[PDB]
């Protein structure tokens, strides 16, 4: 048991492609291999346990993973992403078979999904409110995944990364990213100008 | 069947020492203490096969652990240093049974470095645009939560009494004020989405929610601004015709 490898600590699939987390191990005695996986706010949950009773382990949350003595590996997979699935997942192996004995865990692997944005029709609103904070922000939604969404050019302009929501029972997801200035000189013609989309409503 | 410890957030000093406590309900025979940093996984500091026991990891240095009951097992950071700002994570198994290890929830713990520079975050809401409902007809709000270090919100979207799932996204990490600053605060985005009616309606309560974790009963200061505690700062709205 005394070691792991996680080769591969980001991993980014569309959702309905396979998923694939890698594990190898090195061990002196006779290896218990485990999978945790972590969602956004949570603690360790338990995939799938390997206790030397059958060789194809059948998970939850639709996961599988193959132990192969031959080459020293623990390979996770489920065929088909899910939105849901986007977590940091672990690696571990123990001498005693439960897990009794000490776990030692791999770097972990973080598994992004990328949606299928059906129909999109990029867009650049503006939104205010001057009750909290005189200020003003303006949203680039409804754009789709092919696309990306690059940091500032000015120092004092404030623009965050893209972000899916997804309303259960419309079906429907979008993503969306922030931008945001105190200074009068800027406006949402000024605010996402980098490989933006060239057909979005203002 | 539970794992508790008693933080769940901390701010400390430079130099100060520092207790972190781990406590659980089932008679187990083994506790761990890790800490997970992003790139390198869960590293195990120090174990304890039973009571009065310790033994040390892979990363001991400037560590060190107590074992006077079977419940508890407690982490000591002696000087806390800067790298030693990480999340801390406690488990604990039986040895006799097949149900292997039980995690904690975690407690992370911000080390800095001659001073606390801590204020809660400042929360603007901000209101949907004309042209989206029209254009798509949904309308998304904007919750910003700024001003406030070290990284310790917890972004929550509320509508009419009870907390919301479903048409939210908040940014995974958040990004720096002034990436001058080596101490900078910080600042948040989150957004919260529906339909045009649902928004249309005055009847419909729109409260955007921000908990930090900042300084305790028992910290030390008095300079000229409030004493930046773990409370809840909310902006709300409502719906318009």
């Known amino acids: 048991m005394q070691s792991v490898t996680q080769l591969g600590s980001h991993v980014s699939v569309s959702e309905g492609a396979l998923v694939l987390l890698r594990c190898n191990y090195s061990?002196?005695?006779?290896?218990?291999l485990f999978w945790y996986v972590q969602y956004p706010n949570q603690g360790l949950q338990l995939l799938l346990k390997?206790?030397?009773?059958?060789?194809l382990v059948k998970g939850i949350n639709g996961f599988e993973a193959e132990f192969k003595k031959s080459e020293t590996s623990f390979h996770l997979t489920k065929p088909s992403a899910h939105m849901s699935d986007a977590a940091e997942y672990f690696c571990?192996?123990?001498?005693?078979?439960?897990?009794?004995?000490?776990?030692?865990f791999g770097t972990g692997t973080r598994l992004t999904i990328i949606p299928n944005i059906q129909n999109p029709d990029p867009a650049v609103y503006q939104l205010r409110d001057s009750k909290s904070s005189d200020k003003s922000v303006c949203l680039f939604t409804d754009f789709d995944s092919q696309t990306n969404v690059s940091q500032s050019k000015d120092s004092d302009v404030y623009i965050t990364d893209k972000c899916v929501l997804d309303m259960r029972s419309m079906d429907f997801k979008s993503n969306s990213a922030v931008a945001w200035s105190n200074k009068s000189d800027f406006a949402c013609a000024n605010a996402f100008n980098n490989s933006i989309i060239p057909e979005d409503t203002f | 069947v539970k794992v508790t410890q008693s933080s769940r957030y901390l701010v400390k000093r430079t130099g100060e020492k520092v207790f972190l406590e781990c406590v659980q309900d089932?008679?187990?025979?083994?506790m761990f203490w890790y800490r997970q940093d992003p790139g390198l996984g869960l590293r195990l500091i120090y174990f304890?096969?039973?009571?009065?026991?310790?033994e040390k990891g892979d990363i001991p240095e400037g560590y060190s652990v107590s074992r006077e009951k079977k419940e508890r097992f407690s982490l000591i950071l002696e000087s806390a240093s800067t790298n030693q700002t990480s999340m801390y994570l406690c488990?604990?198994?039986?040895?006799?049974?097949?149900?292997?290890?039980?995690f904690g929830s975690g407690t992370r713990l911000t080390v800095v470095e001659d001073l606390n520079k801590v204020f809660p975050p400042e929360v603007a809401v901000f209101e949907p645009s004309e042209a989206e409902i029209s254009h798509t007809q949904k309308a998304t709000l904007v919750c910003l939560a700024t001003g406030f270090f070290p990284d310790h919100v917890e972004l929550s979207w509320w509508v009419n009494g009870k907390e919301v799932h479903s048409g939210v996204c908040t940014d995974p990490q958040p990004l720096k004020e002034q990436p001058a600053l080596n101490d900078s605060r910080y600042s948040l985005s989150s957004r919260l989405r529906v339909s045009a009616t649902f928004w249309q309606n005055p009847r419909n309560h729109f409260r955007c929610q921000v908990q930090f974790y900042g300084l305790s009963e028992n910290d030390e200061w008095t300079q000229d601004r409030a004493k930046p505690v773990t409370q809840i700062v909310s902006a709300e709205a409502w719906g318009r015709a």
């Open positions: 488990a604990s198994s039986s040895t006799g049974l097949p149900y292997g290890y039980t």
């Open positions: 061990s002196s005695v006779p290896p218990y």
């Open positions: 390997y206790t030397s009773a059958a060789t």
């Open positions: 571990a192996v123990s001498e005693s078979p439960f897990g009794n004995e000490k776990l030692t």
């Open positions: 089932m008679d187990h025979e083994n």
């Open positions: 304890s096969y039973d009571v009065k026991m310790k």
